[PDB]
Amino acid sequence: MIQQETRLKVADNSGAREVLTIKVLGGSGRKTANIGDVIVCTVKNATPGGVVKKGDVVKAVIVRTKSGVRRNDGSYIKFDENACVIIRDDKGPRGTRIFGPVARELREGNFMKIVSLAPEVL
Amino acid sequence: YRKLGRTSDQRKAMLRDLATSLIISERIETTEARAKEVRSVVEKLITLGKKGDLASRRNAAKTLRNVEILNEDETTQTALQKLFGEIAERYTERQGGYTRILKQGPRRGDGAESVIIELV
């Protein structure tokens, strides 16, 4: 359950280490977002170098929240930390080296470049 | 379960006091709600007394008060001893019940329903 002013760790090598969510896209009154939802955010901490610099306003897709998702069979998956990946407006990543486990629910949203580039899809 | 107009600790203390007093006297006068609530407590005590084993005695000591009864012939014994030595014997063949409630009219200082709760 990611809302605005929520801090998130970024799980790629794009350049951004942390972001804060300005808005959850998808509709008027939309308040929270889970894995597979896209947010607009401002990067708060960045690595020296990389394509994304501190202060940029960027799109990102949520991977592995700690609120977790229910599946149709009644199985739930939860994670240790909220995470996100900066996307290039074609649902494609900016980084090249996605880190950390990734939920399988991203395969539906056509984030196949993110899903294939993750060490573990669950 | 009822609250009896009393906090949790005060209600626990009051219920175990009322249980011990019914055991000592075999019949007491109290309010209807308090009797309806002490019925269960004292009856579970008699259930523990009917088992008679040491763990059950150690468990019934959790609820009874350290009260002393003077029998006849200057015989003296605790409430625990009366529970496990005379009242358990009285109800070895009975499989529940153990208490009876007789409603009496309202008392004067309030309109409270006074009742007699006895042993059976």
Partner: protein, 48 residues
């Protein structure tokens, strides 16, 4: 917060038409013949 007018005698006696007590739920005691509260002990005799 405060009454705007008096309450007339008519209005007052209308409001207190349901301010009453009922007769006790009493029954003759089978053993002693005196009235008692149903489901209570007969205080004159002490039975049942």
């Amino acid at each position: 917060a405060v009454p705007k007018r008096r309450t007339s005698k008519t209005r007052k006696n209308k409001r207190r038409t349901h301010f009453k007590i009922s007769v006790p739920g009493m029954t003759e005691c089978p053993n002693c013949g005196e009235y008692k509260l149903s489901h209570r002990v007969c205080k004159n005799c002490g039975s049942y």
